[PDB]
C-alpha cells in the first residue's frame, strides 16, 4: 500500500495473508469470506509468465494478523490449503482478466476480534456502492513504494471506466474496476506489489456491513499520477464464486 496508514487492530479482520512455506515468504493478500473459504487473486497462485504455479501444499494462509513479520500468538491462525480454485477464464496472458481465486482451508477458523468474515455484495449492493467517485478501502502488507511493520490501509475513490481505460494500454475489462485519485484531486494512495489478493471493501451505508467489491489485481508502478490501481470486480464474478463455494456439505 502506498500513502496508506497503519490499520487499527480488528479494523480489517477478514485480512488474510497468503504465505509461501519454503522459502518462508509473504506472497499476497487475500480475504476471509467464511470460516473456511479465502479469496485471493489468481496471479498470486498461477502466473506462467513468471513460472509461478503454486499447489495447495506450497502455501499457508495466516489469518487475524496485524504485524507483517511477527508471529501473533493467540491471535493469528494458520491453515493449510485443501483446494485452490482459479476462475476458469482467468486470462494471465493478456490482462489478468478474472484475476480471482478461492482457497478452501483445511482447518476452518474460529471467528474472534481479529478474525471475522467480510460480505460479498449482492447485485443491489454492488450497483449501489460500486459507483465512480464512491470510496472503498484497500489493505495489505504490500510494498510502501515501487522503488511495513504493520498492516496498511487507504481509502480511495472508484474511477469512471473511461478514465481507467485511457490510463493504460492494457486492455481493460468489465470484470475489472480501477480506483485512486486523479491528479487534480490532491490526494494519493494505491495498492502496490504484494497487495494482490487483498480486499477492496466498502461499508454499506444501508446495513453498516463491509462488502468486498474488488481484489487488488494490477497496476503499472504504484501511486503514479494519471495511473490507477486495477481491481477484480468481485460481483461480476460471483457466479463462479457461488458455484465453487456452494458445491459441498457444511
Amino acid at each position: 500500500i502506498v500513502e496508506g496508514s497503519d490499520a487499527e487492530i480488528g479494523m480489517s479482520p477478514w485480512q488474510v495473508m497468503l504465505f509461501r512455506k519454503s522459502p518462508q515468504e509473504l506472497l499476497c493478500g487475500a480475504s476471509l469470506i467464511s470460516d473456511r473459504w479465502v479469496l485471493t487473486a489468481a496471479h498470486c497462485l498461477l502466473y506462467p509468465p513468471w513460472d509461478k504455479n503454486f499447489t495447495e501444499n506450497d502455501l499457508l494462509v495466516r489469518i487475524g494478523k496485524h504485524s507483517r513479520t511477527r508471529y501473533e500468538r493467540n491471535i493469528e491462525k494458520i491453515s493449510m490449503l485443501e483446494k485452490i480454485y482459479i476462475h476458469p477464464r482467468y486470462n494471465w496472458r493478456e490482462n489478468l482478466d478474472r484475476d480471482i481465486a478461492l482457497m478452501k482451508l483445511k482447518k476452518p477458523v474460529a471467528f474472534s476480534d481479529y478474525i471475522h468474515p467480510v460480505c460479498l455484495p449482492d447485485r443491489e449492493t454492488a450497483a449501489s456502492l460500486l459507483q465512480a467517485g464512491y470510496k472503498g478501502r484497500v489493505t495489505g502488507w504490500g510494498n510502501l513504494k515501487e522503488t511495513p511493520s504493520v498492516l496498511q490501509v487507504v481509502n480511495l475513490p472508484i474511477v469512471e471506466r473511461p478514465v481507467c481505460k485511457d490510463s493504460t494500454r492494457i486492455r481493460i475489462t468489465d470484470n475489472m474496476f480501477c480506483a485512486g485519485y486523479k491528479p487534480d484531486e490532491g490526494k494519493r494512495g494505491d495498492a502496490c506489489e504484494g497487495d494482490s489478493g487483498g480486499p477492496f471493501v466498502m461499508k454499506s451505508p444501508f446495513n453498516n456491513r463491509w462488502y468486498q467489491m474488488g481484489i487488488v489485481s494490477w497496476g503499472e508502478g504504484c501511486d503514479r499520477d494519471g495511473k490507477y490501481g486495477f481491481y477484480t470486480h468481485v460481483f461480476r464474478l460471483k457466479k463462479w464464486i457461488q458455484k465453487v463455494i456452494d458445491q459441498f456439505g457444511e
Binding site: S5, E8, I9, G10, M11, P13, I33, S34, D35, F111, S112, D113, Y114, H116, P117, V118, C119, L120, G133, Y134, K135, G136, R137, V153, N155, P157, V201, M202, K203, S204, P205, N208, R209, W210, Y211
Partner: peptide, 28 residues
C-alpha cells in the same frame, strides 16, 4: 457469514474506525 462485515472491534462495539467516515461522505 450472516454476521459478515460487522467487525467485533468496531461495528459490534458501536465504535467507528479512524477513516471510515471518509467512505461514508464519499456517498454524498
Amino acid at each position: 457469514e450472516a454476521d459478515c462485515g460487522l467487525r467485533p472491534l468496531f461495528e459490534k462495539k458501536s465504535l467507528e474506525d479512524k477513516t471510515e467516515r471518509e467512505l461514508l461522505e464519499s456517498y454524498i
